[PDB]
Amino acid sequence: SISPADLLTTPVLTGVGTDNRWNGEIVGLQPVPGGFSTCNRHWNLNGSTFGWSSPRFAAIDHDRGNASYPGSSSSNVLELWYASAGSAADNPISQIAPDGFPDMSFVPFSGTTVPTAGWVGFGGIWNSSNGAPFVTTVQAYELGFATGAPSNPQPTTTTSGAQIVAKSIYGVATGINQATAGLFVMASGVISTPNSSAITYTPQPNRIVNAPGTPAAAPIGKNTPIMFASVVRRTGDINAEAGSTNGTQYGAGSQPLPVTVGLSLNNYSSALMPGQFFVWQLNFASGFMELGLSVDGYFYAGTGASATLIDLSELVDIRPVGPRPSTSTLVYNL
Amino acid sequence: SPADLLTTPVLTGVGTDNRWNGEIVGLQPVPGGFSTCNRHWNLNGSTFGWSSPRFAAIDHDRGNASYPGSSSSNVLELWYASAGSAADNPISQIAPDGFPDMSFVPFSGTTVPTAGWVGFGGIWNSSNGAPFVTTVQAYELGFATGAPSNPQPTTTTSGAQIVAKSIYGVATGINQATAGLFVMASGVISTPNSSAITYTPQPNRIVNAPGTPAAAPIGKNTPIMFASVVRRTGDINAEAGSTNGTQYGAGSQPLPVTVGLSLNNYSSALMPGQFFVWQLNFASGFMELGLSVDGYFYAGTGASATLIDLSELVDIRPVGPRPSTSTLVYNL
Ligand SMILES: CC(=O)N[C@@H]1[C@@H](O)[C@H](O[C@@H]2O[C@H](CO)[C@H](O)[C@H](O)[C@H]2O[C@@H]2O[C@@H](C)[C@@H](O)[C@@H](O)[C@@H]2O)[C@@H](CO)O[C@@H]1O
Ligand SMILES: [Cl-]
Ligand SMILES: [Cl-]
């Protein structure tokens, strides 16, 4: 009750807990031997986030971007919306981007190409004059951070000097050209794919967008940072779920959302010292492993150089162990 | 004990409602009573509904997809199947996990229906799982009878159909006798103009499965719903305090409560006829909320239908089991 123990209970990793990027049911642990950073909808143990999102999945809303489509015919066109990072004046957490905007770099596309590994959400453009949707622009949109929009958007992984971009991955019924227009997109995303095949866990570390000051997660001895893997829909085979014959698609997040929520409500600085992990034991049908939580809010496992996904289907229960030195190897007994 | 099911964050900004997944900001008394089963659990670990305590996606692989006329551009796309056909759903075959428990509001021409549950998604190819990309739109979903020619609302799942109809024109309509539906499970409310409407759904719009217990007043204790601010199609930018009005959606339970009831059995916590009671401490007074064995919440507000604002709620404390015949304290 004064310790971090209650942040991670059995249900968080055995079917109830979802990840803090995709809001998908967590079903695996993904080690990241090469390290990574994440700030959006990520909290530390001192009540702080470096991102721009609250620990929830609602809607993405920005009232002042540029909306356009190419060419002289407005039917069945790709709709583009973009604004500058730092323009989210109505966001009380951070003005970097609208609450819920995904922390992934923009994958550009044009013509008839559907992008690969884009964060995609449903919604459209809306009318800055009155708040009404431009009903002919509803579609699935890729959202991400870029530089060089509108003519040549390219991915960027820093928010400084960035643009926030939304582009319909399929043709909207009728395009809209308005220099000032709003964006509205539901905050629960899917992964864009051009065919039926699953791709690697998404986002890969080098696709994650981070704000200045975001601490990095790197290996500490044999302890390696992890992401939490969930089953996420993909556009090329939207019906595919866990156990699909077309392959399983994973999305990854830096924290279980229940942990993020708990961290956002509390301050755990008096409970865990810098350089300590809080450790839990994960008990499987056969064997167990330890997970450690750092003061920066990253989770670790004692898996060393391994990049192999750990399946949680046989996870039985979680028990708190207590604070440990981060230099002490987390047990891996699977 | 049930005590930990309702803690302060559940009603002070973190907890969302179990129909719209909106942040709970008010308590809405229902003096006439109501029923709800979908994504609603009792204290005996069971639901009469067809949805798990989460908001993911609505997916059904075997419906009929159509649009009217010889021109496919900018048309209203219709999808329907029979209730009882959700074979892939381990909770209930009544409907796909996440399908909304609201009766269908018919519409035509260019008029947007009032008080419809609306979600984003489209039709997909039952043969390979690929989306019909030209059918993506905002769709009204609900239970009806008489589709495809004349869908009309029904509030019982028995003999019902599940219907999705785009409220705006799709880029290119699709006619397929067997086709899938895919719609994200977090909804918005349809309105025909910028004005907010009454809290949605009203009790007479809620669809229930046979056997669902009703929540009725017990003396001066009245069943409540949990109110959240929900987006509306007529003014999608509107949030709390909009000069075009504030739109509320309502649910029978806070989702965190639903989740907890789904994981454990609370049968031993309440003797017959009892509420589990919490005290809600506001800045200038307090009130009690009671939870019945059927999973419905009550307040001692009698005939009042006035929304209770939670902006001034400070903390929640568990009280314990109390007889339901005792008026719940209301001192605000
Ligand atoms: C062309 C015209 O007159 N449009 C107005 C529109 O400007 C109004 O918007 C509100 O304007 C005030 C300033 O006068 C504030 O900026 C409000 O925040 C703004 O409302 C918000 O945005 C609008 C677009 C709606 O989405 C509303 O629900 C939001 O609260 C509106 C509202 O008075 O009226 C006319 O459309
Ligand atoms: Cl925002
Ligand atoms: Cl039918």
Ligand SMILES: [Cl-]
């Ligand atoms: Cl196809």
